mmCIF file of N, CA, C and O in Angstrom:
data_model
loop_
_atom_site.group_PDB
_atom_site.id
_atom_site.type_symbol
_atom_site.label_atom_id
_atom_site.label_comp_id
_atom_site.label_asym_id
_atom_site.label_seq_id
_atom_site.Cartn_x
_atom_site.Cartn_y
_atom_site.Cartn_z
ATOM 1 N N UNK F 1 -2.783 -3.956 5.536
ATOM 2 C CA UNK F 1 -3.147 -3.088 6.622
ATOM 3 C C UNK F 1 -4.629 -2.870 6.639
ATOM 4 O O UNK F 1 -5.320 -3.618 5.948
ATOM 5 N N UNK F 2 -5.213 -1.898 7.374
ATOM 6 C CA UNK F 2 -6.717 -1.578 7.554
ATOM 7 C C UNK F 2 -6.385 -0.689 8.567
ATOM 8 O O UNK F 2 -5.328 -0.429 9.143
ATOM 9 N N UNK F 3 -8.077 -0.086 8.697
ATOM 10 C CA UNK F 3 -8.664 0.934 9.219
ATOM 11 C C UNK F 3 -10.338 1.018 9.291
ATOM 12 O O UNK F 3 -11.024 0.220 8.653
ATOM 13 N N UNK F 4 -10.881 1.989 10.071
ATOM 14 C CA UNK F 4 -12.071 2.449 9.773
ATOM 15 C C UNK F 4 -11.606 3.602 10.820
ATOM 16 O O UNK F 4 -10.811 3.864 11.723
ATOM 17 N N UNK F 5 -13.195 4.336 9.667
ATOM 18 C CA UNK F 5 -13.862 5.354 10.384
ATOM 19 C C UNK F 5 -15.020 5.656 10.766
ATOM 20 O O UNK F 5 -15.843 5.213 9.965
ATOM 21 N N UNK F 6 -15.698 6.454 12.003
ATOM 22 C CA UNK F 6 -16.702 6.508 12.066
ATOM 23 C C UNK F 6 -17.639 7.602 13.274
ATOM 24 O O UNK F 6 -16.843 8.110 14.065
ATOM 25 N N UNK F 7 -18.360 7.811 13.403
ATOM 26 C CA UNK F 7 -19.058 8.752 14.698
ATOM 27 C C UNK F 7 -20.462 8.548 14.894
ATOM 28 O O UNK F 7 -21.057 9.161 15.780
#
């Protein structure tokens, strides 16, 4: 699986 985060 995966992801990110960010702003």
């Amino acid at each position: 699986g995966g992801g990110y985060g960010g702003s």
